[PDB]
Design a protein around this ligand. Structure first.
Ligand SMILES: C[C@@H]1CC(=O)Nc2ccc(S(=O)(=O)C3CC3)c(c2)CN(C)C(=O)[C@H](Nc2ccc3c(N)ncc(F)c3c2)c2ccc(OCC(F)F)c1c2
Ligand SMILES: [Ca+2]
Lengths: 55, 250
């Protein structure tokens, strides 16, 4: 599932025993209830540009 | 950087400037508050290991605006498989003596997981390369940070499109063969950053080429996805005395 369109995950994807898939996030982010989206939990998450985010 | 543009101040917040005795040495990428990824070849000629400085929040070399943060480099970690003066395994992991403070101008780039980088990031066509390197082949280096968008090629495609060493599984080609746009020697160690669903990730390191922006040749970048496990294990390790450390690879 992870090989195809990143398994629908915004960030990381883990394949499980069967047709199961778990999305995960980098440190400084948490997974939303949709099970695919990553939201920042810190002021300066990695790979985001503050002057563009604050606009 | 040849044929790019000035990176607007604060839009490349993970870019590092490496200095030796106050002189420009190479670029680098901040991946958290204490670790920097650069190129192993940046350190081939270093004798003054205690005079290595990393600068974060840098933009214009002619002026100090208060956003710059300087740190001494406590450790330079290079894979055992890297041979000085050659191209393969061109990566270095740098430990800063004290962490940088994250601000609107100092932010780490995400180091991705190997699977995500190989299965997804490797297929994003364009990525950004940046540095204070040469603005022209045999020309002056830049006073303001420059950035360039470059497309990635499959290695079979790079070899057929090129007019010289091998491109190994630890490298990838990116750029143009018409001599208009490329990263240069002074950009060595800097990031090749990839955007995916609203977030930027580290995919390459400015490594080598056959003259800057020369017709028939592409830029060659270290394939960072091959080093994720090696980097993660070292970031979990305790510091060792002495600046230079050679660590087994794989
Ligand atoms: C690392 C590989 C082998 C080697 O010569 N090692 C090597 C060791 C130390 C130094 S140093 O000055 O102490 C250090 C930077 C501070 C250097 C080089 C300086 N230097 C010439 C360099 O750093 C240059 N780097 C780049 C980087 C990107 C380039 C690009 N994207 N397009 C065109 C270029 F010309 C691009 C050129 C480069 C050109 C060819 C090349 O190897 C050529 C191969 F045929 F052997 C290599 C590197
Ligand atoms: Ca400055």
């Amino acid at each position: 599932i992870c090989v195809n369109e990143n398994g629908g995950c915004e960030q990381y994807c883990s394949d499980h025993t069967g047709t199961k898939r778990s999305c995960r996030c980098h440190e400084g982010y948490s997974l939303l209830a949709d099970g695919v989206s990553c939201t920042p939990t810190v002021e300066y998450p990695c790979g985001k540009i503050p002057i563009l985010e604050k606009r | 950087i040849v044929g790019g543009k000035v990176c607007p101040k604060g839009e490349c917040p993970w870019q590092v400037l490496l200095l030796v005795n106050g002189a420009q040495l190479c670029g680098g990428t901040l991946i958290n508050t204490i670790w920097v990824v650069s190129a192993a070849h940046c350190f081939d000629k270093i004798k003054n290991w205690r005079n290595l400085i990393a600068v974060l929040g840098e933009h214009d070399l002619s002026e100090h605006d208060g956003d710059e943060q300087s740190r001494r480099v406590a450790q330079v970690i290079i894979p055992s498989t890297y041979v000085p003066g050659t191209t393969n395994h061109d990566i270095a992991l740098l430990r800063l003596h004290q962490p940088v403070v994250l601000t609107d101008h100092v932010v780490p780039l995400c180091l991705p997981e190997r699977t995500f980088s190989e299965r997804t990031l490797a297929f994003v066509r364009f990525s950004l390369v940046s540095g204070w390197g040469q603005l022209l082949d045999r020309g002056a280096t830049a006073l303001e940070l420059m950035v360039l968008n470059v497309p990635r090629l499959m290695t079979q495609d790079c070899l057929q499109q090129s007019r010289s060493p091998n491109i190994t599984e630890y490298m990838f080609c990116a750029g143009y063969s018409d001599g208009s746009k490329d990263s240069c020697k002074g950009d060595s160690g800097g990031p090749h950053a990839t955007h995916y669903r609203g977030t930027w990730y580290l995919t390459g390191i400015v490594s080598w080429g056959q003259g800057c922006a020369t017709v028939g040749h592409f830029g060659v970048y270290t394939r960072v996805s091959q080093y994720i496990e090696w980097l993660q294990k070292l970031m979990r390790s305790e510091p060792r005395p002495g600046v230079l450390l050679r660590a087994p690879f794989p």
